[PDB]
Amino acid sequence: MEAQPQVISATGVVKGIDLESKKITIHHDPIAAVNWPEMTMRFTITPQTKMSEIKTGDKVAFNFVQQGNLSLLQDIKVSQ
Ligand SMILES: [Ag+]
Numbered sequence: 001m002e003a004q005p006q007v008i009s010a011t012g013v014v015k016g017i018d019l020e021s022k023k024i025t026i027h028h029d030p031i032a033a034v035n036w037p038e039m040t041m042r043f044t045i046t047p048q049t050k051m052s053e054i055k056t057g058d059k060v061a062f063n064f065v066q067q068g069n070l071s072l073l074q075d076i077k078v079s080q
Helices: none
Strands: 008-018 023-028 039-044 059-067 070-078
Antiparallel strands (some): 008 023, 008 059, 059 070
């Protein structure tokens, strides 16, 4: 609804992943929607994040929302 954050799409390379602590670090390409340059950033897996098999070193396509100080993944998959 109205106050909820918008869904941001991006692409990048997985630098590391820890399913136990719900952490994925992604070196992503620029994101115009939030005025971010190419960056490495901490993303957060939630129980709702729609995942496929992801491993360190994979190129990925993903969507997230910014909710306070966390970047919450909505979905992630390997990409070309
Ligand atoms: Ag970022």
